[PDB]
Coordinates of C-alpha atoms in Angstrom, one line a residue:
Chain J
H608 CA 46.3 -10.5 12.9
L609 CA 43.2 -12.6 12.3
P610 CA 41.6 -14.0 9.2
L611 CA 39.0 -11.7 7.6
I612 CA 35.5 -12.4 8.7
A613 CA 33.1 -13.6 6.0
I614 CA 30.4 -10.9 5.9
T615 CA 28.2 -12.9 3.4
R616 CA 25.6 -10.2 2.7
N617 CA 25.4 -9.0 6.3
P618 CA 26.0 -5.3 6.2
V619 CA 27.0 -3.7 9.5
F620 CA 25.9 -0.1 9.7
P621 CA 27.8 2.1 12.3
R622 CA 26.3 2.0 15.8
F623 CA 23.8 -0.7 14.7
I624 CA 23.6 -4.2 16.2
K625 CA 23.7 -6.9 13.5
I626 CA 23.8 -10.7 13.3
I627 CA 26.2 -12.6 11.1
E628 CA 25.4 -16.3 10.4
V629 CA 27.9 -18.0 8.0
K630 CA 27.0 -21.5 7.0
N631 CA 30.7 -22.6 6.9
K632 CA 31.9 -24.0 10.2
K633 CA 35.5 -22.9 9.8
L634 CA 34.8 -19.6 11.7
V635 CA 33.6 -21.7 14.6
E636 CA 37.2 -22.7 15.3
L637 CA 38.3 -19.0 15.2
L638 CA 35.5 -18.0 17.6
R639 CA 36.3 -20.8 20.0
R640 CA 40.0 -19.9 19.9
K641 CA 39.2 -16.3 21.0
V642 CA 37.0 -17.3 24.0
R643 CA 40.1 -17.8 26.2
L644 CA 41.0 -14.1 25.5
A645 CA 40.2 -11.8 28.3
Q646 CA 38.7 -9.2 25.9
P647 CA 37.3 -11.1 22.9
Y648 CA 36.8 -9.0 19.7
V649 CA 35.6 -9.5 16.2
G650 CA 36.6 -7.6 13.0
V651 CA 33.9 -6.2 10.8
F652 CA 34.4 -5.1 7.2
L653 CA 32.5 -4.7 3.9
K654 CA 32.6 -6.8 0.8
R655 CA 33.2 -5.3 -2.7
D656 CA 31.1 -5.9 -5.8
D657 CA 30.7 -9.3 -7.4
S658 CA 30.6 -11.3 -4.1
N659 CA 32.4 -14.6 -4.3
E660 CA 32.9 -17.0 -1.4
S661 CA 35.9 -18.6 -3.2
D662 CA 37.6 -15.2 -3.6
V663 CA 37.3 -14.6 0.1
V664 CA 39.5 -17.5 0.9
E665 CA 41.7 -17.0 -2.2
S666 CA 42.4 -13.3 -2.2
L667 CA 42.2 -10.9 0.8
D668 CA 41.8 -7.8 -1.5
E669 CA 38.1 -8.4 -2.0
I670 CA 37.3 -7.2 1.5
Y671 CA 37.4 -3.4 1.7
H672 CA 40.3 -1.9 3.6
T673 CA 37.7 -0.2 5.7
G674 CA 36.6 -2.0 8.9
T675 CA 34.7 -1.6 12.1
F676 CA 36.5 -3.0 15.1
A677 CA 34.1 -3.9 18.0
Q678 CA 33.9 -6.1 21.1
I679 CA 32.0 -9.4 21.1
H680 CA 29.0 -9.5 23.3
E681 CA 27.9 -13.1 24.0
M682 CA 27.1 -16.4 22.3
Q683 CA 23.4 -17.5 21.7
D684 CA 23.5 -20.2 19.0
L685 CA 19.7 -20.7 19.1
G686 CA 19.0 -22.4 15.8
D687 CA 22.4 -22.5 14.1
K688 CA 26.0 -23.0 15.3
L689 CA 27.1 -19.4 14.4
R690 CA 25.1 -16.3 15.5
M691 CA 27.9 -13.7 15.7
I692 CA 26.8 -10.4 17.1
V693 CA 28.6 -7.5 15.4
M694 CA 28.3 -3.9 16.5
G695 CA 29.7 -0.6 15.2
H696 CA 32.2 0.7 17.8
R697 CA 35.5 1.9 16.2
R698 CA 35.8 2.6 12.5
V699 CA 39.3 2.0 11.0
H700 CA 40.9 2.3 7.5
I701 CA 43.9 0.0 6.9
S702 CA 46.5 1.6 4.6
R703 CA 47.4 -1.8 3.1
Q704 CA 45.5 -4.9 4.3
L705 CA 47.9 -6.9 2.1
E706 CA 50.8 -6.4 4.6
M707 CA 48.6 -6.5 11.0
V708 CA 49.4 -2.8 11.2
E709 CA 46.4 -0.5 12.0
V710 CA 45.7 3.0 13.2
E711 CA 42.6 4.7 14.5
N712 CA 42.6 7.3 11.7
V713 CA 39.1 8.6 12.6
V714 CA 38.5 12.1 11.2
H715 CA 35.9 14.3 12.8
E716 CA 37.1 17.7 12.0
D717 CA 34.7 20.5 12.8
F718 CA 34.7 24.3 12.7
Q719 CA 35.2 26.4 15.8
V720 CA 32.0 28.3 15.2
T721 CA 29.0 26.0 15.8
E722 CA 25.7 27.8 15.2
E723 CA 24.6 26.5 11.8
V724 CA 26.5 23.2 11.9
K725 CA 23.6 21.6 13.9
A726 CA 21.0 23.5 11.8
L727 CA 21.4 20.8 9.1
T728 CA 20.8 18.2 11.9
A729 CA 17.3 19.5 12.3
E730 CA 16.6 19.0 8.6
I731 CA 18.2 15.6 8.7
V732 CA 16.0 14.4 11.6
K733 CA 12.9 15.9 10.0
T734 CA 13.7 14.0 6.8
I735 CA 14.3 10.8 8.7
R736 CA 10.9 11.3 10.5
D737 CA 9.2 11.8 7.2
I738 CA 10.8 8.7 5.7
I739 CA 9.9 6.5 8.6
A740 CA 6.3 7.9 8.6
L741 CA 5.8 7.3 4.9
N742 CA 8.2 4.3 4.8
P743 CA 8.0 2.5 8.2
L744 CA 11.1 0.4 8.8
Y745 CA 11.8 0.4 12.5
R746 CA 9.9 1.3 15.7
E747 CA 9.6 4.9 16.8
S748 CA 10.8 4.3 20.3
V749 CA 14.4 4.8 19.1
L750 CA 13.6 8.3 17.9
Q751 CA 11.9 9.2 21.2
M752 CA 14.9 7.8 23.2
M753 CA 17.4 9.8 21.1
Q754 CA 15.9 13.3 20.8
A755 CA 18.1 16.1 19.4
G756 CA 16.8 18.4 22.1
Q757 CA 17.8 16.1 24.9
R758 CA 21.5 17.2 24.4
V759 CA 22.6 13.6 25.1
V760 CA 24.0 13.4 21.6
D761 CA 27.8 13.5 22.3
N762 CA 28.5 11.9 18.8
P763 CA 26.7 13.8 16.1
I764 CA 28.6 11.8 13.5
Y765 CA 27.3 8.5 14.9
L766 CA 23.8 9.9 15.0
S767 CA 24.0 10.9 11.4
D768 CA 25.4 7.4 10.5
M769 CA 22.5 5.7 12.3
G770 CA 20.0 8.0 10.6
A771 CA 21.5 7.2 7.2
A772 CA 21.5 3.5 8.1
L773 CA 17.8 3.5 7.5
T774 CA 18.5 4.1 3.9
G775 CA 18.0 1.2 1.5
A776 CA 20.9 2.2 -0.7
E777 CA 23.2 -0.4 -2.0
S778 CA 26.4 -1.2 -0.1
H779 CA 28.3 0.6 -3.0
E780 CA 26.6 3.8 -1.9
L781 CA 27.6 3.2 1.7
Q782 CA 31.2 2.6 0.5
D783 CA 31.1 5.9 -1.5
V784 CA 29.8 7.7 1.6
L785 CA 32.6 6.3 3.7
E786 CA 35.2 7.3 1.1
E787 CA 34.2 10.9 1.8
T788 CA 36.4 12.6 4.4
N789 CA 34.8 16.1 4.6
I790 CA 31.8 16.2 7.0
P791 CA 29.6 18.3 4.6
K792 CA 30.2 16.0 1.7
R793 CA 29.2 12.8 3.7
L794 CA 26.2 14.5 5.2
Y795 CA 24.9 15.7 1.9
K796 CA 25.5 12.4 0.2
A797 CA 23.7 10.6 3.0
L798 CA 20.5 12.7 2.8
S799 CA 20.3 12.5 -1.0
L800 CA 20.8 8.7 -0.9
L801 CA 18.0 8.6 1.7
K802 CA 15.6 10.4 -0.7
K803 CA 16.4 8.0 -3.5
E804 CA 15.8 4.9 -1.4
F805 CA 12.5 6.3 -0.3
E806 CA 11.5 6.8 -3.9
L807 CA 12.1 3.2 -4.7
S808 CA 10.3 1.9 -1.7
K809 CA 7.3 4.1 -2.3
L810 CA 7.1 2.8 -5.9
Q811 CA 6.9 -0.8 -4.6
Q812 CA 4.2 0.2 -2.1
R813 CA 2.3 2.4 -4.6
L814 CA 1.7 -0.5 -7.0
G815 CA 0.1 -2.5 -4.3
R816 CA -2.2 0.3 -3.1
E817 CA -3.0 1.3 -6.7
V818 CA -4.4 -2.1 -7.5
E819 CA -6.9 -1.5 -4.6
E820 CA -7.7 1.9 -6.0
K821 CA -8.6 0.4 -9.5
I822 CA -10.7 -2.3 -7.9
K823 CA -12.6 0.3 -5.8
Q824 CA -13.1 2.4 -8.9
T825 CA -14.5 -0.6 -10.9
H826 CA -16.7 -1.6 -8.0
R827 CA -17.9 2.0 -7.8
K828 CA -18.8 2.3 -11.5
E829 CA -20.5 -1.0 -11.1
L830 CA -22.3 0.3 -7.9
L831 CA -23.8 3.3 -9.8
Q832 CA -24.7 0.8 -12.5
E833 CA -26.3 -1.3 -9.7
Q834 CA -28.3 1.7 -8.5
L835 CA -29.8 2.3 -12.0
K836 CA -30.0 -1.5 -12.4
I837 CA -32.1 -1.8 -9.1
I838 CA -34.4 0.9 -10.4
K839 CA -34.6 -1.2 -13.6
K840 CA -35.0 -4.4 -11.7
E841 CA -38.2 -2.9 -10.3
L842 CA -38.9 -1.3 -13.7
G843 CA -37.0 -2.7 -16.7
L844 CA -36.4 -6.3 -15.6
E845 CA -39.9 -6.0 -14.1
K846 CA -39.0 -8.5 -11.3
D847 CA -40.7 -10.9 -13.7
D848 CA -39.2 -14.3 -14.3
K849 CA -41.3 -14.9 -17.4
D850 CA -39.5 -14.8 -20.8
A851 CA -36.4 -16.0 -19.0
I852 CA -34.7 -19.3 -19.9
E853 CA -36.4 -21.1 -17.0
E854 CA -39.9 -19.8 -17.7
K855 CA -39.3 -19.9 -21.5
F856 CA -38.5 -23.6 -21.5
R857 CA -41.3 -24.2 -19.0
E858 CA -43.8 -22.7 -21.4
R859 CA -42.2 -24.5 -24.3
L860 CA -42.8 -27.8 -22.5
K861 CA -46.2 -26.6 -21.2
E862 CA -48.1 -27.7 -24.3
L863 CA -46.6 -31.2 -24.6
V864 CA -48.2 -34.4 -23.2
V865 CA -45.1 -35.1 -21.2
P866 CA -44.0 -38.1 -19.0
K867 CA -42.8 -37.8 -15.4
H868 CA -39.2 -38.9 -15.5
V869 CA -38.5 -36.2 -18.0
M870 CA -40.2 -33.7 -15.6
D871 CA -38.0 -34.6 -12.7
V872 CA -34.9 -34.5 -14.9
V873 CA -36.0 -31.0 -16.1
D874 CA -36.6 -29.9 -12.6
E875 CA -33.1 -31.0 -11.6
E876 CA -31.6 -29.3 -14.6
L877 CA -33.5 -26.0 -13.9
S878 CA -32.3 -26.1 -10.3
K879 CA -28.8 -26.5 -11.5
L880 CA -29.3 -23.7 -14.0
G881 CA -30.5 -21.4 -11.3
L882 CA -27.6 -22.4 -9.1
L883 CA -25.1 -22.2 -12.0
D884 CA -23.8 -18.8 -12.9
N885 CA -24.7 -17.7 -16.5
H886 CA -21.1 -17.2 -17.7
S887 CA -19.8 -20.6 -16.7
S888 CA -19.2 -23.2 -19.4
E889 CA -21.2 -25.7 -17.3
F890 CA -24.1 -23.3 -17.5
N891 CA -23.8 -23.2 -21.3
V892 CA -23.7 -27.0 -21.5
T893 CA -26.7 -27.2 -19.2
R894 CA -28.6 -24.7 -21.3
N895 CA -27.8 -26.7 -24.5
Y896 CA -29.0 -29.9 -22.9
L897 CA -32.2 -28.3 -21.7
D898 CA -32.8 -26.9 -25.2
Chain B
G67 CA 18.9 31.0 7.2
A68 CA 21.6 33.4 8.5
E69 CA 23.3 32.8 11.8
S70 CA 22.1 34.3 15.1
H71 CA 25.3 36.3 15.0
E72 CA 24.2 37.7 11.7
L73 CA 20.8 38.7 13.2
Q74 CA 22.6 40.3 16.1
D75 CA 24.8 42.3 13.7
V76 CA 21.7 43.4 11.8
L77 CA 20.1 44.6 15.0
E78 CA 23.3 46.5 15.8
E79 CA 22.7 48.7 12.8
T80 CA 20.7 51.8 13.6
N81 CA 20.0 53.7 10.3
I82 CA 17.1 52.2 8.4
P83 CA 19.0 52.2 5.0
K84 CA 22.0 50.6 6.7
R85 CA 20.0 47.8 8.2
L86 CA 18.1 47.3 4.9
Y87 CA 21.3 47.0 3.0
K88 CA 22.8 44.6 5.5
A89 CA 19.6 42.5 5.3
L90 CA 19.8 42.5 1.5
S91 CA 23.5 41.5 1.6
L92 CA 22.6 38.6 4.0
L93 CA 19.8 37.6 1.6
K94 CA 22.2 37.7 -1.3
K95 CA 24.8 35.5 0.6
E96 CA 22.1 33.0 1.6
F97 CA 20.7 32.8 -1.9
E98 CA 24.2 32.3 -3.3
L99 CA 24.9 29.5 -0.9
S100 CA 21.6 27.9 -1.6
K101 CA 22.2 28.2 -5.4
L102 CA 25.7 26.7 -5.1
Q103 CA 24.2 23.8 -3.0
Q104 CA 21.4 23.2 -5.5
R105 CA 23.9 23.3 -8.5
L106 CA 26.2 20.8 -6.7
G107 CA 23.1 18.6 -6.0
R108 CA 22.0 18.7 -9.6
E109 CA 25.6 17.8 -10.8
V110 CA 25.7 14.9 -8.4
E111 CA 22.2 13.8 -9.4
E112 CA 23.4 13.8 -13.0
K113 CA 26.5 11.8 -12.1
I114 CA 24.3 9.2 -10.3
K115 CA 22.0 9.4 -13.3
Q116 CA 24.9 8.1 -15.4
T117 CA 23.8 4.8 -14.0
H118 CA 22.2 3.1 -17.0
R119 CA 18.5 2.8 -17.2
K120 CA 19.2 -0.9 -17.5
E121 CA 19.7 -0.8 -13.7
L122 CA 16.2 0.7 -13.2
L123 CA 14.8 -2.0 -15.5
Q124 CA 16.6 -4.7 -13.5
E125 CA 15.2 -3.2 -10.3
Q126 CA 11.7 -3.4 -11.8
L127 CA 12.3 -7.0 -12.8
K128 CA 13.5 -7.9 -9.3
Chain X
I333 CA -34.5 9.6 -15.0
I334 CA -34.8 6.1 -16.4
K335 CA -33.8 7.0 -19.9
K336 CA -30.9 9.2 -18.7
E337 CA -29.7 6.3 -16.6
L338 CA -29.9 4.0 -19.6
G339 CA -28.0 6.5 -21.7
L340 CA -25.2 6.9 -19.2
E341 CA -24.6 3.1 -19.1
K342 CA -25.8 2.4 -22.6
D343 CA -22.5 0.8 -23.7
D344 CA -21.7 -2.7 -22.3
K345 CA -18.0 -2.1 -23.2
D346 CA -16.2 1.1 -23.8
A347 CA -15.6 1.8 -27.6
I348 CA -16.5 -1.8 -28.3
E349 CA -20.2 -2.3 -27.8
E350 CA -21.1 0.7 -30.0
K351 CA -18.5 -0.2 -32.6
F352 CA -19.8 -3.8 -33.0
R353 CA -23.5 -2.6 -33.0
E354 CA -22.7 -0.1 -35.8
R355 CA -20.9 -2.9 -37.6
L356 CA -24.0 -5.1 -37.2
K357 CA -26.2 -2.2 -38.4
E358 CA -25.4 -2.8 -42.1
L359 CA -26.1 -6.5 -41.7
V360 CA -29.5 -8.0 -42.7
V361 CA -28.9 -10.6 -40.0
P362 CA -30.8 -13.5 -38.5
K363 CA -32.6 -13.2 -35.1
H364 CA -30.7 -16.1 -33.5
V365 CA -27.3 -14.4 -33.7
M366 CA -28.8 -11.1 -32.5
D367 CA -30.1 -12.7 -29.3
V368 CA -26.8 -14.6 -28.9
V369 CA -24.9 -11.4 -29.3
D370 CA -27.2 -9.5 -26.9
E371 CA -26.6 -12.2 -24.2
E372 CA -22.8 -12.1 -24.9
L373 CA -22.7 -8.3 -24.7
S374 CA -24.7 -8.3 -21.4
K375 CA -22.2 -10.8 -20.0
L376 CA -19.4 -8.6 -21.5
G377 CA -20.7 -5.6 -19.6
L378 CA -21.1 -7.6 -16.5
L379 CA -17.5 -8.7 -16.7
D380 CA -14.4 -6.5 -16.4
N381 CA -12.2 -5.3 -19.2
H382 CA -9.0 -7.4 -18.5
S383 CA -10.5 -10.8 -17.6
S384 CA -9.1 -13.7 -19.6
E385 CA -12.7 -15.0 -20.1
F386 CA -13.5 -11.5 -21.1
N387 CA -10.7 -11.6 -23.6
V388 CA -12.0 -14.9 -25.1
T389 CA -15.5 -13.5 -25.3
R390 CA -14.1 -10.4 -27.1
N391 CA -12.2 -12.5 -29.6
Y392 CA -15.4 -14.6 -30.2
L393 CA -17.4 -11.4 -30.7
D394 CA -14.8 -10.1 -33.2
Chain R
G261 CA -30.0 22.7 -12.3
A262 CA -33.3 23.7 -13.9
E263 CA -33.3 23.7 -17.7
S264 CA -32.7 26.8 -19.7
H265 CA -36.4 27.0 -20.4
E266 CA -37.1 27.5 -16.7
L267 CA -34.5 30.3 -16.6
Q268 CA -36.2 31.9 -19.6
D269 CA -39.5 31.7 -17.8
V270 CA -38.0 33.3 -14.8
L271 CA -36.6 36.1 -16.9
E272 CA -40.1 36.6 -18.4
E273 CA -41.4 37.3 -14.9
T274 CA -41.6 41.1 -14.2
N275 CA -42.6 41.5 -10.6
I276 CA -39.9 40.9 -8.0
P277 CA -42.1 38.6 -5.9
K278 CA -43.0 36.5 -9.0
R279 CA -39.5 36.1 -10.3
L280 CA -38.0 35.4 -6.8
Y281 CA -40.8 32.9 -6.0
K282 CA -40.2 31.1 -9.3
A283 CA -36.5 30.9 -8.6
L284 CA -37.2 29.6 -5.1
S285 CA -39.6 27.0 -6.5
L286 CA -36.9 25.9 -8.9
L287 CA -34.4 25.6 -6.0
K288 CA -36.9 23.4 -4.1
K289 CA -37.2 21.3 -7.3
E290 CA -33.4 21.0 -7.4
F291 CA -33.5 19.7 -3.8
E292 CA -36.2 17.2 -4.8
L293 CA -34.1 15.9 -7.7
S294 CA -30.9 15.7 -5.6
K295 CA -32.6 14.1 -2.7
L296 CA -34.3 11.5 -4.9
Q297 CA -31.0 10.6 -6.4
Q298 CA -29.4 10.5 -2.9
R299 CA -32.1 8.3 -1.4
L300 CA -32.0 5.8 -4.3
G301 CA -28.2 5.7 -4.0
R302 CA -28.2 5.2 -0.3
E303 CA -30.9 2.5 -0.3
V304 CA -29.1 0.6 -3.0
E305 CA -25.8 1.1 -1.1
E306 CA -27.3 -0.4 2.0
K307 CA -28.6 -3.3 0.0
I308 CA -25.2 -3.9 -1.7
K309 CA -23.5 -3.7 1.7
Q310 CA -26.0 -6.4 2.7
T311 CA -25.3 -8.4 -0.4
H312 CA -21.5 -8.5 0.3
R313 CA -22.5 -9.1 3.9
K314 CA -24.3 -12.2 2.8
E315 CA -21.2 -13.8 1.5
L316 CA -19.5 -12.7 4.7
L317 CA -22.3 -14.4 6.7
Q318 CA -21.8 -17.6 4.8
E319 CA -18.1 -17.2 5.6
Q320 CA -19.0 -16.7 9.3
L321 CA -21.1 -19.9 9.1
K322 CA -18.2 -21.5 7.4
Chain L
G1040 CA -28.4 -10.7 29.3
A1041 CA -29.3 -13.8 31.4
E1042 CA -32.7 -15.3 30.7
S1043 CA -35.6 -14.6 33.0
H1044 CA -35.2 -18.1 34.5
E1045 CA -31.7 -17.2 35.8
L1046 CA -33.1 -14.0 37.3
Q1047 CA -35.8 -16.0 39.0
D1048 CA -33.2 -18.5 40.4
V1049 CA -31.2 -15.5 41.7
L1050 CA -34.3 -14.1 43.4
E1051 CA -35.0 -17.5 45.0
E1052 CA -31.6 -17.3 46.7
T1053 CA -31.8 -15.6 50.1
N1054 CA -28.2 -15.2 51.2
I1055 CA -26.6 -12.0 50.0
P1056 CA -23.2 -13.6 49.1
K1057 CA -25.0 -16.4 47.2
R1058 CA -27.0 -13.9 45.0
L1059 CA -23.9 -11.7 44.5
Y1060 CA -21.9 -14.8 43.3
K1061 CA -24.8 -15.8 41.0
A1062 CA -24.9 -12.3 39.5
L1063 CA -21.1 -12.4 39.0
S1064 CA -21.4 -15.8 37.3
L1065 CA -24.1 -14.5 35.0
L1066 CA -22.0 -11.5 34.2
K1067 CA -19.1 -13.9 33.4
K1068 CA -21.3 -16.0 31.2
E1069 CA -22.4 -13.0 29.2
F1070 CA -18.8 -11.7 29.0
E1071 CA -17.6 -15.1 27.6
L1072 CA -20.4 -15.1 25.0
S1073 CA -19.7 -11.5 24.0
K1074 CA -16.0 -12.0 23.8
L1075 CA -16.4 -15.1 21.6
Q1076 CA -18.7 -13.1 19.3
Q1077 CA -16.3 -10.2 19.0
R1078 CA -13.3 -12.5 18.4
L1079 CA -15.2 -14.4 15.7
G1080 CA -16.3 -11.2 14.1
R1081 CA -12.8 -9.8 14.0
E1082 CA -11.4 -13.1 12.7
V1083 CA -13.9 -13.2 9.9
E1084 CA -13.3 -9.5 9.0
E1085 CA -9.5 -10.2 8.9
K1086 CA -10.1 -13.2 6.7
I1087 CA -12.2 -11.2 4.3
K1088 CA -9.6 -8.4 4.2
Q1089 CA -7.0 -11.1 3.6
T1090 CA -9.2 -12.4 0.7
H1091 CA -9.2 -9.0 -0.9
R1092 CA -5.5 -8.7 -0.4
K1093 CA -5.1 -12.2 -1.9
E1094 CA -7.0 -10.9 -5.0
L1095 CA -4.5 -8.1 -5.1
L1096 CA -1.6 -10.5 -4.7
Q1097 CA -3.1 -12.7 -7.4
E1098 CA -3.1 -9.7 -9.7
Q1099 CA 0.6 -9.2 -8.7
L1100 CA 1.1 -12.9 -9.5
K1101 CA -0.4 -12.3 -13.0

């Protein structure tokens, strides 16, 4: 019988360490009240659509009846005054959170014959490996530590839940998965959701890499143009500065009995023109002034 | 994708036509299971597709 | 080789340089604007298609 | 890559040594053309690498 | 890579430990210079890669 914890956009996947940091200091009193308890614990739930902080303190129906009871680990409070550590230990589904009565109604029914039940596990782990390879989200050391062949997986349901935790699916999809009771239904939903999330993430990455591909293609067309243009620079441009703006104006002023101040001004202007790129507006102004 | 028990049962058969028919039956069963799974997947993908394209446009906006 | 290379990169801009040149063909036009247009088209070819300065240059050319 | 005229000339040849020698000479000519293009491309590519490198060297000095 | 003057100074030394220490010091000097060169090179390469990525991110900003 404790007040519902304010998740505040802090999803807690099963068997996954998460950190909850609520700005409100009201939960500080609750946390300090449970310190005296020999076995401190924290309740974990999931919020419904249209998150609203006011509704959390106004109505308790916003928080999903589903919850994940777990034990508190330790207090850090490095930067803020609330750094709750929430872990996925024991799932629970309250019949009526309005009325607290609870029961560990964890359903893990399985068939007596287990020869193809773990066959889908191989495909699931292969898909997870593919997703992390193409869409890196976490370090690979976790996969090496937990290898399907090691036989140390006493909780295949928890392994599947952690594997599906890598999915970027919205919390609504996670709630829909949780609603499923049959094992095949939840497994299938998990893998399909994973593929969808990967598609979205790869779209976002693909635009970024595609910009580089277009830039490389432009530079490559320009590079072939530069090859023929180097052959031309030897041949067509003739490596001759005559007939250019610089030399054209030099020859234009060649035949005039000219003072010296104008000569130094023209030398400065020509130095700028050479330094100035042709396209720039400053270059056009300099050219007009020189004309 | 048949079970190891199915493979053992196939090996138990001796006559060539009998083992061929058993293998064909196993292939039929596996194909039926795969087709049912694919049809269920297509139906669920359509159900998720009921999500309006406005959601995809909003995702692109974000 | 030289003339083939010139032919390959004959157009400063795709479907624009040739279009404007053929538009200018029917024009008994002064030399000044010809040289200005040649310089502008050389810059156009030097620039990329989607640059804002390229867009302003294209509008001026039109 | 020899023009169709070269192929016609090869066809005109009757003796096996003559036709095969002309084909071999055309193949050597193909190598000469390809190697000329490759050498020009590679030289200009080293120079463009150096041109980009020059801005990189000004950045190192910076 | 120590200059010939350093090698002559090492040769002038007669005690084996002294010349060994001088050789180790020269090795450390060369190591420091080489490490600085490599660090600066990698830093500049990272900065140029970040400049290209900044051009990409400026396109994304557009």
